[PDB]
Symmetry: D3
Subunit: 157 residues, 6 copies
């Protein structure tokens, strides 16, 4: 059983690590798929986000980190994944995820959308909040893998 976990991951946080870790305990192979996501004008390049997520997930033996610009339902099919994973935190995410799941079902009905809820520890954070706290000299070491915190400090310096 193969699952894909697609997202912008700009940068990957402990909330994303929590989700991908739970996914590795349920599936034989997990593809952590990083979208180029130019409409979000990311802080980190796609190559930087892939290297960061690779170093942050290296302790999980069945995780493969890749980048993509394709329609996520096509990319799942190309990874031979029958499950597409998304984390669920808040009501805003839930409404967006319902639209995304129904569209993905229309495009690839054999691809199952599965939702996981992160630890309470990460239920009130996002990459966007973390970046803004760090932009204002707020400490975010608790929310990010060590290598990601280093890269975020380096990018803002």
């Amino acid at each position: 059983k193969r699952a894909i976990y697609p997202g912008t991951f700009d940068p990957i946080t402990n909330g994303h690590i929590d989700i991908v870790t739970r996914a590795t305990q349920m599936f034989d192979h997990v593809i952590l798929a990083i979208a180029a996501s130019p409409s979000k004008k990311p802080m980190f390049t796609l190559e930087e986000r892939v290297a960061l997520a690779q170093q942050a997930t290296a302790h999980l033996g069945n995780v493969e980190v890749v980048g993509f610009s394709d329609l996520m339902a096509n990319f799942a099919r190309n990874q031979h994944a029958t499950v597409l994973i998304r984390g669920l935190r808040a009501v805003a995410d839930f409404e967006y995820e319902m639209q995304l799941a129904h569209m993905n079902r229309h495009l690839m009905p054999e691809l199952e959308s599965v939702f996981l809820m992160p630890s309470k520890e990460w239920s009130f954070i996002s990459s966007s909040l973390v970046k803004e706290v760090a932009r204002h000299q707020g400490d975010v070491t608790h929310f990010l893998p060590e290598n990601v915190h280093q890269a975020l400090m380096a990018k803002l310096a």
Copy 2:
């Protein structure tokens, strides 16, 4: 009885067609009003959106398609419309629509805001989602009138 259904309609989808069709069964005359909406930086010009909505609603004999840049409550008064129609899909739309309706009531208390819910078929789509799926080579023929799908493919080509 005259109603106006104002929106960006960038582009008009089957969800909007569903709403305007239900409106034609309740009112003698429906004005489908397309806002120039420059703050949304639309994909299609106002002239293109009016021509698209005109061709998509031509089978409804009591629909008139017009463009506007005015305050929507003034534009309703100018069309001699006593009803302003808006579609309701999700919680996010509902909160926004509550603010819009209360402001419109403050500006024109004799203008009644009326809400319609689209078919379940269109309850998980928006113009923005459709455009992004199409931008990533995803098929959206099911969500749009034929002429609109043609124009969207032509614009992205």
Copy 3:
């Protein structure tokens, strides 16, 4: 020509309901304020009391008729030759319930249109249930009710 029903429990009818039915009278030639005879939740006021209160409170509106009903609200609309069913929307909890109700009514009677109206900001944070509970705890609810309803609620709570 255009006929609409406005169904509910109205236990009792509040100024929020009056606001909704008044706006409906400006849009439709005839409005039937439809009172649920037997909701699953036992009402404080009997059907006869709820109908009498709603009639007195809407007597100034010439195109409203108050009628009791025990059937499917979609069947009641059809029997009343009403092609529009009106519901008021106040909050997110109302919205989710109204979405289920509207999609079900559409499956039952696809020719019946559900329309939603929003009440004044004045009545957007009240319900019949909140008003009854405040009055039971001896709180001032005069502002939220028609005069006759305020009289009936005081009399009911006194005994």
Copy 4:
């Protein structure tokens, strides 16, 4: 190898539940459709009826077993050697309740994963409660139920 439980009241099982359990069968080797013996709210159908209806309605799915349970759903998953607990998500009210349920199940059994599936748009606005109430008010609910459930609900309401 991978085992999942899908717990609920299923009073009665609807096409929304069938949709969820069918999708779960495509992801897991074995799925236990787990029926709550004694919910706090008295069910319309007894446990024996709910189990018989769910069995007949899932008989075409080879890797589903229908089982009644009265314990903590997290304890039931562990006793069934299931490391995944499935729940369907339809609306915002479901989401808030499911968040409380999932965080509690994680405190009780941290090795048990809660997974969420979304049903077809066709079943996203129904519930067993809405379907029962529509049928009690003599409304057509055939579209929302497996054939055997539609037969059982008609028979129950007739008497």
Copy 5:
């Protein structure tokens, strides 16, 4: 000088309530933890038990007094010379109910301010109702309760 009331059913008081009342003690000179004598929903614990549990659980906080009340919470605040009414906010369902409650309390007592506090993430997914139901189904709830409450809940469920 500044006095606040923190009203609720507290059936029983949880670590979520302790979190809220502790934060209130840091902001106000005197905090009255106000326990509802007769809620519409019958409590598991009697008023005497809920007051005794809340007193023992807040005994380390020097500026808290636990008091039972049966009146309008806005009237209770005024009689206690409290110009602030505290409520905890966890989720969207709490938010909608609290909005209705705050606007009503403002109509009843405009000089009374409603303030909202958010509990720790640790207690953001629990309620007294969830905790009681988990304990009734023999689940471990020790982490969510003060020691004395955990003792009282075990004793109540044993008989």
Copy 6:
């Protein structure tokens, strides 16, 4: 007891006045803190927003208006404020405020986040809605202090 009420206040509305007025009745000293907030690309400069909020709150003897670009939890500590006030209107605000409060608690656990609900009169407005209504020649005199309405008309002229 000292409280801070931080925000963009672009411009300050009657909803914000309502909140700061309620805060003055609970605390000995209230600091109304205006964030430079460049990510929101404000309509008014920080200096203009401070002068507007100063004139609009001059009748409240225990209000001090200041500007800031710092992390709001640090700025609260620097004002010797132990309470950070935020207004709550809708579900969208509530979810955002929950994330903000939990992050502020992580950064400054001794700083208490307190929420106030505005009058029903202001529960359906925002600075953004008011500006857009005014941009479309809609009258917004009811929603703003007199001096703010003058400055908004002057800026759009």
